[PDB]
RNA sequence: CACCACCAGGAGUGGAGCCUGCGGCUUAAUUUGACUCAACACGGGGAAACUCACCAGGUCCAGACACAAUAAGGAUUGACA
């Protein structure tokens, strides 16, 4: 439970339609006040998705949430991309790089837990 | 036995001009069914479009669902001039 509970803050976020999944979507979404928590890959390739979304979320005003995690293929199952098959093993999905969140669909204590790790260590 | 037969009759039709239905001819198409009574102002069929089925052209999917493929560093949709 050492900071891999970001799945459950994302999973309750999806049920209240609050993930602007996708490089195009996220970049559009976080170029407004919608940017509420952001999740990034470490690096996929060629370093420029890494440059681009970081510079937009590093604006000179308060809107700087940023969380740095591992490769994208896991991350799509960490978000909602449907591969349930009513819990069956089959992965029919792809992996996203940048998920930006709006409104997080919840009141979770893990939601309480997560920002504090984002704030204090 | 019977004016969907005759008798004694009446009013006609068949002639004419138009209206309408069928065959034919023509047509890109002149959509089609029904040929004695028991087909032919019949399909309640008096069709400008629609009806509409025919002809000449142009859109759309309104091809459920399942399994594969594709694919959030975009599977696909819409459009101003
Ligand atoms: Mg006459
Ligand atoms: Mg007729
Ligand atoms: Mg007729
Ligand atoms: Mg037709």
From Swiss-Prot:
Keywords: Cytoplasm, Isopeptide bond, Ribonucleoprotein, Ribosomal protein, Ubl conjugation
Location relative to the cell: Cytoplasm
Main location per the UniProt record: cytoplasm
GO molecular function, one term: structural constituent of ribosome
Single GO biological process annotation from the record: ribosomal small subunit biogenesis
Domain of life of the organism encoding this protein: Eukaryota
Residue(s) of cross-link: Glycyl lysine isopeptide (Lys-Gly) (interchain with G-Cter in ubiquitin): 63, 73, 92
Membrane-spanning parts: none
Subunit description: Component of the small ribosomal subunit (SSU). Mature yeast ribosomes consist of a small (40S) and a large (60S) subunit. The 40S small subunit contains 1 molecule of ribosomal RNA (18S rRNA) and 33 different proteins (encoded by 57 genes). The large 60S subunit contains 3 rRNA molecules (25S, 5.8S and 5S rRNA) and 46 different proteins (encoded by 81 genes).
Family the entry assigns: Belongs to the eukaryotic ribosomal protein eS12 family.
Function: Component of the ribosome, a large ribonucleoprotein complex responsible for the synthesis of proteins in the cell. The small ribosomal subunit (SSU) binds messenger RNAs (mRNAs) and translates the encoded message by selecting cognate aminoacyl-transfer RNA (tRNA) molecules. The large subunit (LSU) contains the ribosomal catalytic site termed the peptidyl transferase center (PTC), which catalyzes the formation of peptide bonds, thereby polymerizing the amino acids delivered by tRNAs into a polypeptide chain.
Protein name, UniProt field: Small ribosomal subunit protein eS12
Species of provenance: Saccharomyces cerevisiae (strain ATCC 204508 / S288c) (Baker's yeast)
Included range, full protein: 23 to 143 of 143
């Amino acid at each position: 439970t050492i900071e891999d509970a970001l799945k459950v803050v994302l999973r309750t976020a999806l049920v209240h339609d609050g993930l602007a999944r996708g490089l195009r979507e996220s970049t559009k979404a976080l170029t407004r006040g919608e940017a509420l928590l952001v999740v990034l890959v470490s690096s996929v390739t060629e370093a420029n998705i890494i440059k681009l979304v970081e510079g937009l979320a590093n604006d000179p005003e308060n809107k700087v949430p940023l969380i740095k995690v591992a490769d994208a293929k896991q991350l799509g199952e960490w978000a909602g991309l449907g591969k349930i098959d009513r819990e069956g093993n089959a992965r029919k999905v792809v992996g996203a790089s940048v998920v930006v969140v709006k409104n997080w669909g919840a009141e979770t204590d893990e939601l309480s837990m997560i920002m504090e790790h984002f704030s204090q260590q």
